[PDB]
Every structure is written in C-alpha cells, then in structure tokens.
C-alpha cells in the first residue's frame with residue numbers, strides 16, 4: 001500500500017548559485033505529500049523546495065512521500081564543490097585568508113602594543129585602549145604566550161585550530177581557575193599547562209568573535225568572547241573583558257605567521 | 259552597441275561591447291575611471307545615476323555611444339565603515355553636536371608633536387556647559403552618504419577660537435561671556451570628508467566649530483554614541499585640542 005520506491009524520484013539541480021539547489025519531486029506517482037530532510041539541519045514540505053549549502057561538503061538529501069497507506073523515504077548524496085562567499089561571514093573569510101585553505105595568526109611580537117591591559121568596556125573609566133600597560137616588542141618572549149598560534153579555515157564550517165607547546169599565559173586570578181600546573185617564567189605572572197582540543201569552531205556577529213569549547217587567544221582571562229577592533233589581511237586587533245578580574249580589559253594584536 | 263549588466267553585486271557592472279561589427283573600444287565609466295577592453299567592470303559604491311561612454315576606433319576614426327545607468331543603493335562592502343557610523347547608516351543623515359552636558363567635551367593639552375604629549379587635554383578640560391556663553395555649541399555637523407562622503411556644517415554665523423586663531427580669520431571677532439573670541443564665519447553650503455584609518459579630513463578648510471588652523475583630526479573614539487577627536491594646532495606650536503561630539 002505504502003508508496004513503492006521505484007516510482008519515487010527527485011532531481012537536485014544547482015541553480016545560478018551552485019550552492020543553492022532546487023529539490024523537485026519527479027515521482028511517476030501522484031496524490032503524494034512530500035517532505036524533505038536537506039541534510040544541513042533544515043526540513044521542508046512542498047513539491048519543489050530550495051536547499052542552501054554555504055559550506056563545501058557531501059550532504060544526504062531524504063525525500064519522504066506520504067499516501068493513504070503510509071510513507072516511504074528515498075535519498076541522494078550531493079557534492080557541493082566550493083564555499084559560497086555570499087552566505088559566509090565576511091570577517092570569517094579574512095580570518096581564514098580566503099574561502100579556500102587556512103591562515104595562521106601569531107602575536108605581533110616584533111611591534112609595541114601587541115598585548116595590553118586597561119579599564120574594560122563595563123568599567124566607568126573605559127577609554128577603549130590598554131591605558132594601564134602596553135607590552136613593548138618582545139616583552140613577553142620569556143613565557144608561553146607567543147607559542148599560542150591560531151589557524152582559521154572554512155573546511156565544512158567556521159573552523160579553528162589552536163596550536164601551542166602545552167602552556168598558556170595568565171596571572172594570579174587566571175591561574176586559580178585552571179587545573180594545569182602553574183610555573184613562574186622569566187616574564188613573570190604564570191605559565192599554566194593547558195593542551196588545546198584538536199578542533200574548535202567560532203562565530204562572528206558584527207564585531208563580536210566567539211570561540212567554542214571555552215577557548216581563548218593564549219592569554220587566559222576567563223572569556224571566549226572578543227571584540228574585533230581591527231581586521232584586515234595584515235592585522236587582527238582584539239579587545240576582551242576579563243571574567244576573573246572585574247573591570248579589567250585586555251588587548252591583543254595578531255599578524256600572519258611568516 | 260554595449261550592455262551594462264549589474265552582476266551578483268548590483269553596484270558592480272560588466273560593460274561589454276556587443277557591436278555587430280568586429281574594433282578597439284575604450285570606456286569612460288562616469289565614476290572617474292577610463293578603461294580599454296572588449297569587456298570591463300565598473301564599480302559604483304554610491305547610489306546615483308552615471309553616464310557610461312564607449313568610444314569605438316577603426317582606421318576611419320572614432321564614434322562614441324553613451325547610456326545612463328541608475329545604481330539604486332549604497333554598497334556597504336565598498337564604503338569606509340567609519341563613514342557609515344558618522345552618517346548613521348547608508349541612508350539619511352546623522353547630526354553630531356558637542357557633548358555639552360558632560361565634562362571633557364572640549365580641552366587643551368600638549369599636542370602629539372610636543373615632547374610633553376600624554377594623549378589627554380591635561381592643561382584644561384572643559385566642565386559640563388563650560389562654553390555655553392559663546393558660539394562653540396552652535397556649530398553642528400551632519401554626515402550623509404548621498405552620492406559621496408558628504409557633510410553639512412550648520413551654525414548661527416560664528417565660530418569659537420582664541421587670539422592666535424582670530425589673527426588668521428578675516429571675520430569680525432567679539433568677546434563673549436565664556437571669553438576668548440567668537441569670529442564671524444559662515445560655512446559653505448556643502449563639504450566632503452575622507453576617513454583613512456583614524457585620520458578624518460574635512461574639505462575646503464572646514465573645522466569642528468573651534469578654529470585651530472587645521473582640517474585634519476585624529477579619531478580616538480567613533481561609535482554610534484560618541485565621536486572623540488584630537489587635533490594639532492597649526493596656529494599655536496605644540497598645542498593639542500580635544501573635542502567630544504554625540505548625536506543630536
């Protein structure tokens with residue numbers, strides 16, 4: 001009674017934009033209600049629906065046909081070859097150095113002001129700058145900070161890789177919130193043992209950059225949320241608000257790895 | 259013949275020779291750019307009507323055909339982000355005035371070239387309403403992206419300055435309640451600006467109501483709520499000025 005699979009079919013035809021695909025019931029059987037799992041977290045109902053895949057990947061599309069004696073499901077895989085710049089955050093494209101490949105960012109250790117502290121954005125004294133202390137060139141050479149490197153890549157999603165040599169840098173208020181062994185390096189404050197996960201994601205919304213899985217840009221201040229102050233192919237300048245020291249703001253400047 | 263075909267970005271247009279005659283062609287895109295090629299791309303960041311001219315060349319000489327094109331909207335992707343904040347968006351306008359109700363909306367200190375520079379108006383910081391009794395707060399600045407980076411300067415006929423400034427200006431100077439000088443100074447009907455990084459430059463010798471002999475300002479803060487500016491005096495060597503504007 002339930003619809004027979006050999007009479008069910010559909011076409012999935014990329015349109016003007018190869019990442020936007022028309023899904024059309026072409027079944028040799030009428031009197032059907034059809035629903036769709038687009039394989040991208042979206043479900044839909046209708047004879048002809050459109051599916052959008054911002055990211056290059058292989059997806060599975062399921063069509064379910066309903067008639068008076070039940071439902072039957074058929075599938076196709078579809079290969080989306082390339083990322084769609086028109087459906088991806090423009091700042092994510094700068095962080096990854098393009099829609100293809102990856103881009104690694106490191107502390108701007110060769111120039112003054114690559115790391116700094118000042119009154120944070122909720123502090124009555126905020127001025128938007130690290131007005132308490134600004135790190136001179138190579139000022140944090142003698143700790144774990146510059147060992148922390150951040151690669152962005154749009155391989156299936158808004159993906160990040162965090163590499164270090166097993167340690168992050170923080171101060172007394174930071175060290176108390178992490179389980180790893182704390183050491184006092186040459187630059188003072190604390191190195192803490194902290195091994196990143198093998199994979200992260202991120203989101204960009206306006207100026208706000210958020211890292212997944214409680215990640216942070218090598219300096220621990222209890223937050224995974226940053227404000228992008230500057231971002232172009234040469235420079236990533238970030239501000240954050242400390243969650244471990246009420247009213248402290250931190251600034252960080254990254255440049256491309258050579 | 260030619261076609262002017264808006265692409266995936268409606269502000270970016272493919273100009274293509276479609277002539278039924280196989281020619282060297284050049285183009286005036288009507289945006290200040292000229293080009294040579296069978297197929298060229300034109301960019302119009304600003305909504306407007308533009309005239310495109312194709313010139314075809316043989317041995318006999320040259321013939322020029324034109325079309326008008328209408329670009330409906332401003333293109334956020336090709337306009338300075340700080341310009342959009344000053345104009346309050348891609349449409350309409352936004353007027354900025356002195357933050358007269360808060361301390362520190364006007365001040366003086368050692369300027370950025372001065373060995374004593376500390377980045378603040380450390381010689382004098384104006385208290386709330388401190389310059390009510392002069393022309394300073396009468397000066398209002400509107401930014402609008404209507405064809406370009408456009409500004410309108412409104413006042414009630416006077417700017418505010420000190421002795422060194424008054425000596426550079428042709429208008430009559432008067433001493434108001436706040437002291438220093440009001441100077442007769444009527445703005446032009448229209449100005450332009452440029453923003454490059456943190457450098458804000460005004461056209462046609464304009465200045466932000468207080469005269470210090472410069473049209474160049476450093477942007478210290480710019481968000482939808484605040485414009486905080488520094489400038490370096492061109493009439494008093496080593497003197498810096500600070501100004502804080504908020505929306506009207």
Ligand SMILES: OC[C@H]1O[C@@H](O[C@@H]2[C@@H](O)[C@H](O)O[C@H](CO)[C@H]2O)[C@H](O)[C@@H](O)[C@@H]1O
Nearest residue numbers: 116117118119131132133134171245248
């Ligand atoms: O905390 C308020 C005070 O901050 C002081 O600067 C400190 C920096 O020298 C140091 O490098 O970082 C700590 C925070 O991690 C800062 O507190 C300022 O010098 C004081 O002016 C300020 O009141």
Ligand SMILES: OC[C@H]1O[C@@H](O)[C@H](O)[C@@H](O)[C@@H]1O
Nearest residue numbers: 366367380381382420494497
């Ligand atoms: O115009 C410059 C002068 O401004 C005055 O308000 C300050 O008190 C002086 O310190 C400064 O020399």
